[PDB]
């Protein structure tokens, strides 16, 4: 298994991993430009991806993982590691993710790669779409 930046040529591979929530070409292009987004592959079987980006806090920066998908704990862990490395290299202060706690594989991968699930809590208000 390997972890790499994706390009436009990888649109189908990403969408093979994207289930019922497709990644557009526009989204792929934007996330390719961040330097924080990765594709996981076993051979040329796609195995996961992470869409992540830098968000300025006013002094420090956070890298937010907007989306992560993966077919195994191994894929999820390696994607997190690749994101974390890209954050360290950019002098980013922290990496954050909004976790659905039903996703046990992701929860396992997060703990294995040094993420905490507290004490900070996520507050959300969904407004909806037009």
From TrEMBL:
Residues 1-130 form the N-acetyltransferase domain. InterPro entries: Acyl_CoA_acyltransferase, DUF1999, GNAT_dom. It holds the Pfam family DUF1999. It comes from the Bacteria. One of its GO terms (molecular function) is acyltransferase activity, transferring groups other than amino-acyl groups. This is Fe-S binding reductase, putative. It comes from Thermus thermophilus (strain ATCC BAA-163 / DSM 7039 / HB27).
């Amino acid at each position: 298994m390997r972890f790499r930046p994706f390009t436009e040529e990888d649109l189908d591979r990403l969408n093979r991993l994207a289930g019922k929530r497709p990644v557009s070409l526009g989204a792929l292009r934007f996330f390719a430009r961040t330097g924080h987004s990765f594709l996981a592959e076993e051979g040329e079987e796609p195995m996961g991806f992470a869409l992540a980006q830098a968000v300025w806090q006013g002094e420090a920066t956070t890298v937010l993982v907007t989306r992560i998908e993966g077919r195994s704990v191994e894929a999820l862990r390696g994607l997190l590691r690749a994101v974390v490395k890209s954050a360290y290299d950019a002098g980013v202060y922290e990496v954050a993710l909004h976790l659905d706690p039903e996703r046990k594989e992701l929860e396992e991968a997060l703990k294995a790669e040094g993420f905490a699930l507290g004490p900070l809590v996520l507050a959300v208000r969904v407004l909806g779409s037009r």
